Design a protein around this ligand. Structure first.
Ligand SMILES: NC(=O)c1ccc[n+]([C@@H]2O[C@H](COP(=O)([O-])OP(=O)(O)OC[C@H]3O[C@@H](n4cnc5c(N)ncnc54)[C@@H](O)[C@@H]3O)[C@@H](O)[C@H]2O)c1
Ligand SMILES: NC(=O)c1ccc[n+]([C@@H]2O[C@H](COP(=O)([O-])OP(=O)(O)OC[C@H]3O[C@@H](n4cnc5c(N)ncnc54)[C@@H](O)[C@@H]3O)[C@@H](O)[C@H]2O)c1
Ligand SMILES: NC(=O)c1ccc[n+]([C@@H]2O[C@H](COP(=O)([O-])OP(=O)(O)OC[C@H]3O[C@@H](n4cnc5c(N)ncnc54)[C@H](O)[C@@H]3O)[C@@H](O)[C@H]2O)c1
Ligand SMILES: NC(=O)c1ccc[n+]([C@@H]2O[C@H](COP(=O)([O-])OP(=O)(O)OC[C@H]3O[C@@H](n4cnc5c(N)ncnc54)[C@H](O)[C@@H]3O)[C@@H](O)[C@H]2O)c1
Lengths: 334, 334, 334, 334
C-alpha cells in the first residue's frame, strides 16, 4: 500500500507505473482497468518486459484478481471508463495510459464510476498540465485532474529552468532522436493522424513532430513561444535523447553551463537531470533510475551567444517514475 | 489489361498482386477494394514499399480511381465484401489478401457482392487449396473459388514433389526461419490467437506454429502425414528459409540428392524451385523473381536414409508471383 | 578470492568469466592478460555491457591494476602469452578467450610465463575437451589443460544424456538459430576462414556451420557419429536456441520426453537444462542463470520413432558460468 | 572506358566508385588495388551488396584480372600503394578509399607507385579539398592531387551556398542522424581514436564527432567559423539526414526559404540539392541518384532571424556519385 491508485492501460507505460508505484513509492494498493488483457495476461505482461528485464517477487493469479507481491490488485474489464467502476478498491487517485483519453471532458469523465483526482500520461490541449521539474506550488487542491507532460516535453523542462534561469535564452529550437513507440509500425502500412508516415520500424530514420515548446512553455511560462520542435524516431526500442540549441542573453562558457547544471542538479532537482561528465554512454540509461539526463561532452560547442546542448531520456520508465513522483506530490498536497 | 482482376487488401501482399499482376501478367484492367486506404494512399502506399523499393512509370489518381500505368484502376473502400460493388469493372477474378477472409463461406460471399471466381492469398479450413508447384489437373471449372498455399506452405510443396517421387521419404519434420509478418509487433503487448507472443519484434527470435503438415499433404496427397512443422520468426522483414529433414526409402548421396532437383528443376518446374550451387547467399532473394529456392551446400549432411535438406522463400513476393501464376492458369481453364 | 585465476581476452566471454568467477564462485583473486585494452579500458568495458546491464560494486583504477570490488586484479599487456608472465599473482589455473589460441601446442604454451592448468573457451582439434554436463570422472589430474565445448556444443550435450540414455536415438540432425557473434560483420565485406559469408549483421538470416556432433560425441561417446550440424546466425546479439530432431530406439510420447528431462533435470543436472512448461518465452533468458534450457511446447511433434525437440542457450553467459563451474571441478579435483 | 581510372579500397565506398564510374561516366578502362580481396572476391564482393542490391550484366574473372562488363579490369593486391604498380593500365586518375591514406604526403606516394592525379574518398588534414557542390574554378592544374569532402561534409556544402548567399546566416550549428559506418561494431569492444564507443551497433543511438565546421568552411570560405557540429550514429546501414540551425541576416519566411533552394535547385546545382515538398520520405533515398537532398516540410519552423532547416544523404552512394562527378570535371581541366 501507500496513496490509493488504479490504472488505465496495462501497457508499457502502465506496467512501470503499476510496477514502480509499488517498489519506488509503493503507495497503497490499487486495481487494473484493462479491457483487452485478461486475468492472466496481466500476470505475464506486467512481469515480463523485453525492454526492462522480468518482474521478480511473484506476480500471480489468485482471487478475483492479481496478487502482485500479495498486495491485492484487481482486473476491471470495461471499455469506456465511466463504464467501468473504480469506486471499488477506493482508488481515489488513478493514472491512465490508453491513447484516446486525454482532456478534462474525458479523464474528467471517470469519476462517474468512482475516481477523485486522475493523473494522465501525456499532454492535453484542454486541462491542467505539469511535470515534476517546474510543478511547484502550481498544483492546487482546487484541482481535480492533472497531466504529466510527454516523454519529450518532461525531460526538456528540467534543462529549461537551470539554463534559462541563469543565462538568458532568447530563441532556441530542438530535435529528439527517440526510441520507438507504441505507434511506429512493422514493415509498411497506413498510419493515421500526423501520418508519422507509419512506414518503418526497423528500416528507416523517421522524421516527426512533437510540441516541445507548447509543453515546455506551459511548464516554464517565460519560455512558451521562444521554443518549438520536431523529432526523428529511430528504430531504438527503449531510450532517447534531446538536442537543444540556444542563443543566449548572458555569455556562456561551455565549462560554465555544465557546472551550473552540476551545482544546480546537485541541490534542488536531484530527481530529474544528472550531469555525467561520464563519456559517451550512448544509450545505456534504460531505466537508469533518473528522468532527464544531461551530460557535459556530447555535442557541445560554444561561442558567447549561440551554444548547443544535449540532455536525455529513458522515456518509458524515467517517465513512469515522475508520475509516481507527482502522484505523491498531488496526494500529500491535496 | 490481361485477365481481368480485383483485389482484397491493398497491403503488403496486396500491392504485389496488383504490382505484378500488371508487370508479370498484367491481366488486364482491374479495381481496388480497400476500407482504410483512401483514394490517394493507394498511389503512395502501393507505389512505396520500404521492402522492395518504390514503384516507377507512374502511379497517379485522376477521375474516380487511380491510373496504374494509365490502366484505369478503381478504389472501393467497403467494409465487408458483400457490401462492395465488384461487377463494376467486370472483374470475375478478384484475389483476397485480408486476414480473416478464409473459407468458402465468405470468399463465396464477394460473389454475391458481384464476383465470379476469387483466389485467396492464404490457406483455408474448408475450400479448394492449391499451389502452382503441385497444382496440375487438380484445378477444374467445378471451381468457382480457390486458394494458393501459405507463404511457407507454397515453398515446401515444390521441394517435396522433386524429393518424394524420386527418393522415398518416410517421416520428415520442418522449421522455418521466417521473416516478419503483418502480425509481428513492436515493444511487447496483448496479442491473440495461436498466441505468437506479440512479444518482441527487433529484440527476440520468436518461437512459432505452422501447418506445413496438412498443407503440403493436400498439395501432394501421398506426403500428408509423413510431415508437420513449426517456425521461428525473426526481425528479418522480407524473405525466409525452410528446413526439412527426412528419412528416405531409396538411398541418397548428397551429391545425388542435390543432383535430382538440378535436372528436375531445369525441366517441369522452372518458375518454382531454383538450385544454387552458388554459395549461401544469406537472404538477398527479396524479389529475386523465384518461388521457392533451394541450393546445394547450405546445411546439407548425408547418410543412406537420413538427411536434412534446405530450401528458401522470397515469401511476400515470390508468393505474390505464384498468385498471378495461378490467376494465369485459373482463367485459362474455366 | 577462491581458486586462483588469470584470463586471456578481456572481452565478452572474458568479462563474464572475469565477472562471474568473482560473484558466482569468486574463487580467489586473479590478473588480466589484455593486449589491446588498457589499464582504464578494463574498468569501463568489463563494468558496462549492452547485452547484460552495467557492473555495480565499483570497478576502479588504482595501483598498477584494477580493483574490482577491491580484490586486487592486474593488467598484463603482452601479445604472445609465453611472452607475458602469469607467474605473478600466482595464477595457477587461467582461462583464455582470444580467437587464435586453442590446441595443446599453444594453450599448452602459456606455462612458460607461469600458468599450471589452463581452461579454454572453445573447442580444439588437438586436446582434452569437456563440458559441465557429461565431464564426470573424465577430468584427470593427469591432465594439464582442458577446454569447454562451444556455445552450441555445450548446450547440445545436456539434451543428449537424458534423451539418448533413455529412449534410443539412432540418427539425429540439428540447426541452431543463434545470436551474433564477435565475427559477424557491419554492412558488407570480406570475411575469412569458413567465409561465414561475412556479409550481414543486421540485414540477413546467415546460414552457417558448426560441429555439433564431433563435440557432442567427444562429450557423450555413444552419440559421436550419429549427430552433425549447421546453424544460421541471425541478427539477435545475445541468446540462441537449438533444434534437435531424432529417430529413436524406445518409443516416445511427447508427454514422456518432457517429464524424463523434468524428473532428470530435477536431480543430477540441476545446473544445465531447465524445462519450462512455461510458453514461448522467445528469447528472454540472456543470462537467465541457467546453461542449456529446454522446454516442453515449442516445436514438438511426436510419432513412435521420429520426434522433434528444442533446448536453448543464452551463449555468452550460461557459457561463462559452466566454465567457472568446471574451474572448481578441475581445481578441487586436481 | 572513359577517363582512365584505378582505385583504393575495393569496399563499400570502393565498389560504387568502380560500379558508377562505369554506369554513370564509365570513364574508361581501369584497375583494382586491394590487399585482402583476391581476384575472385572482387567479382562477388563488388557484385553483391546487401545494401544496394546485387550488380548485373556480368562480373567475371578471365585472364589475370576481372571482366567488368568486358572492360578488362585488373587486380593488384599490394599493401602499401608505393609498392603497387599502377602505370599498369595507364591510370593517371586513381581514387583512394582506404581509411588511413589521407594527406598529400601519402596520396602523393602512389604517384611514385606509378600514378598522376588521385581523388580521395574522405577529408584530409593538409591537401586540397573540394566537393562538387561549391567546387567551381577552385580546381586548377597546379593540381596533381585532390579530395571530395566527407559523406556528410559534401552534403552540407550544397545547402549552404543556396542559404548563405541568399539570406545572411550568422551562427549555425548541426547534427547528423547518420547511417552505419565501416568503423561501427557488433557486440561491445575496444575501439580507438576519437573513441566512438565501438560500443553498440544494433542496440544504441551512438553520440559522435564530425567536422562540418572546418569542412564546409573550406568549401565555402565565407562560412568557415559561423559553423561546427556533431552527429549520432544509429543502426541505419545506408543513408543519413542532416540538421542545420541558423540565424540569418535578411529575414526569411519558411515559405521563402524553402522557395530559394527550389528556384536555385532547378538551375545551377541539379545533381546536388533536391527539394521534395513530396513528404518526409523517411530514409528511402539509398541509391536515389542524388547528392544531398532537402525538402520542405520536415522539421522546419520559422522566425525572422532564427530557423532550423534539414537536408539528407544517400551517403555511401550519393558520395560515390560525386567522386565520379569530380573525376569527371578533374580530368577535363588538367
Ligand atoms: N510508450 C512510450 O514510448 C512513451 C513515452 C512517454 C509517454 N507516452 C504516453 O503514454 C501513453 C500510453 O501508451 P503505451 O505505449 O504505454 O500503451 P500500449 O500500447 O503498450 O498499451 C496500451 C493499451 O491500453 C489499453 N487502453 C487504454 N484504456 C482502454 C479501454 N478502456 N479500452 C480499450 N483500450 C484501452 C490499450 O488501448 C492498449 O492496448 C501514450 O498514449 C502516450 O500518451 C509513451
Ligand atoms: N561470443 C560468443 O557469442 C560465444 C559463445 C560461446 C563461445 N565463444 C568462444 O569464446 C572466444 C572468445 O571470443 P569473444 O567473443 O568473447 O572476444 P571479443 O572479440 O569480444 O574480445 C576478444 C579480445 O581478446 C584479445 N585477445 C585474446 N588474446 C590476445 C593477445 N595476446 N593479443 C591480441 N589479442 C588477444 C582479442 O583478440 C580480442 O580483441 C571465441 O573465440 C570462441 O572460441 C563465443
Ligand atoms: N506479411 C508477410 O510477410 C506474408 C508473407 C507471405 C504471405 N502472407 C499472406 O498474406 C496475407 C495478408 O496480407 P498482408 O500481410 O500483406 O496484410 P496487410 O495488413 O498489409 O493488408 C491486409 C489488410 O487490408 C485491409 N482490408 C481489406 N479489405 C477489407 C475489408 N473489406 N474489410 C475489412 N478489412 C479489410 C485490412 O486492414 C487488413 O488487415 C496473410 O494472411 C498470408 O496469407 C504474408
Ligand atoms: N562507410 C560508410 O557508410 C561511408 C559513407 C560515406 C563516405 N565514407 C567514406 O569512405 C571511406 C572508407 O571506405 P569504406 O567505408 O567503404 O571502407 P571499407 O572497409 O569497406 O574498404 C576500405 C578497406 O580496403 C582495404 N585497403 C585497400 N588498399 C589497401 C592497401 N594498399 N593497404 C592497406 N589497406 C588497404 C582495407 O581493408 C580498408 O579498410 C571513409 O574514410 C569515408 O571517407 C564512408
Amino acid at each position: 500500500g501507500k496513496v490509493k491508485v488504479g490504472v488505465d492501460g496495462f501497457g508499457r507505460i502502465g506496467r512501470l507505473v503499476t510496477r514502480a508505484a509499488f517498489n519506488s513509492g509503493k503507495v497503497d494498493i490499487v486495481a487494473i482497468n484493462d479491457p483487452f488483457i485478461d486475468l492472466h495476461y496481466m500476470v505475464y505482461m506486467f512481469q515480463y518486459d523485453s525492454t526492462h528485464g522480468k518482474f521478480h517477487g511473484t506476480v500471480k493469479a489468485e482471487d478475483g484478481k492479481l496478487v502482485i507481491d500479495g498486495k491485492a490488485i484487481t482486473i476491471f474489464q470495461e471499455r469506456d471508463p465511466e463504464n467501468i467502476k473504480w469506486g471499488d478498491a477506493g482508488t481515489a487517485y488513478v493514472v491512465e495510459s490508453t491513447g484516446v483519453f486525454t482532456t478534462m471532458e474525458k479523464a474528467g469523465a471517470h469519476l462517474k464510476g468512482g475516481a477523485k483526482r486522475i493523473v494522465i500520461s501525456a499532454p492535453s490541449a484542454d486541462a491542467p498540465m505539469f511535470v515534476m521539474g517546474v510543478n511547484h506550488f502550481k498544483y492546487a487542491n482546487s484541482l481535480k485532474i492533472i497531466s504529466n507532460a510527454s516523454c519529450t516535453t518532461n525531460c526538456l523542462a528540467p534543462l529549461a529552468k537551470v539554463i534559462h534561469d541563469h543565462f538568458g535564452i532568447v530563441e532556441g529550437l530542438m530535435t529528439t532522436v527517440h526510441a520507438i513507440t507504441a505507434t511506429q509500425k512493422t514493415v509498411d502500412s497506413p498510419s493515421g493522424k500526423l501520418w508519422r508516415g507509419g512506414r518503418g520500424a526497423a528500416q528507416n530514420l523517421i522524421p516527426a513532430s512533437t510540441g516541445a515548446a507548447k509543453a515546455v512553455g506551459k511548464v516554464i511560462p517565460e519560455l512558451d513561444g521562444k521554443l518549438t520542435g520536431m523529432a526523428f524516431r529511430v528504430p531504438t526500442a527503449n531510450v532517447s535523447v534531446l538536442d537543444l540549441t540556444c542563443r543566449l542573453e548572458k555569455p556562456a562558457k561551455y565549462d560554465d553551463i555544465k557546472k551550473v547544471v552540476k551545482e544546480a542538479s546537485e541541490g534542488p532537482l536531484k530527481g530529474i537531470l544528472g550531469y555525467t561528465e561520464d563519456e559517451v554512454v550512448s544509450d545505456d540509461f534504460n531505466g537508469s533510475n533518473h528522468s532527464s539526463i544531461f551530460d557535459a561532452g556530447a555535442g557541445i560547442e560554444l561561442n558567447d551567444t549561440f551554444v548547443k546542448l544535449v540532455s536525455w531520456y529513458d522515456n518509458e520508465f524515467g517517465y513512469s517514475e515522475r508520475v509516481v513522483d507527482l502522484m505523491a506530490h498531488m496526494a500529500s498536497k491535496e
